[PDB]
């Protein structure tokens with residue numbers, strides 16, 4: 001989950 005978001009950065 002964290003990674004799913006972190007791709008933005």
Ligand SMILES: *C(=O)c1ccc(-c2ccc(C(=O)OCC)cn2)nc1
Pocket residue numbers: 001002003004005
């Ligand atoms: C959410 O974006 C998220 C959570 C956890 C994972 C993930 C990917 C790969 C592994 C892995 O290779 O584990 C080896 C024990 C674990 N968790 N991806 C995305």
Ligand SMILES: *NNC(=O)c1ccc(-c2ccc(C(N)=O)cn2)nc1
Pocket residue numbers: 006007008009
């Ligand atoms: N928001 N994330 C990025 O801008 C980003 C993170 C990580 C990478 C990247 C690219 C290539 C490798 C590799 N070949 O091991 C690892 N991480 N790009 C963009």
Ligand SMILES: CCc1ccccc1
Pocket residue numbers: 001004
């Ligand atoms: C449903 C959001 C999500 C994304 C990736 C991993 C787990 C959960």
Ligand SMILES: CCc1ccccc1
Pocket residue numbers: 003004
């Ligand atoms: C963690 C990378 C990812 C995101 C969404 C769906 C599958 C795999």
Ligand SMILES: CCc1ccccc1
Pocket residue numbers: 004005006007008
């Ligand atoms: C900026 C694109 C995006 C949207 C949602 C989650 C991650 C990345």
Ligand SMILES: CCc1ccccc1
Pocket residue numbers: 003004006007
């Ligand atoms: C940031 C890791 C990742 C990989 C594939 C897809 C989304 C996110």
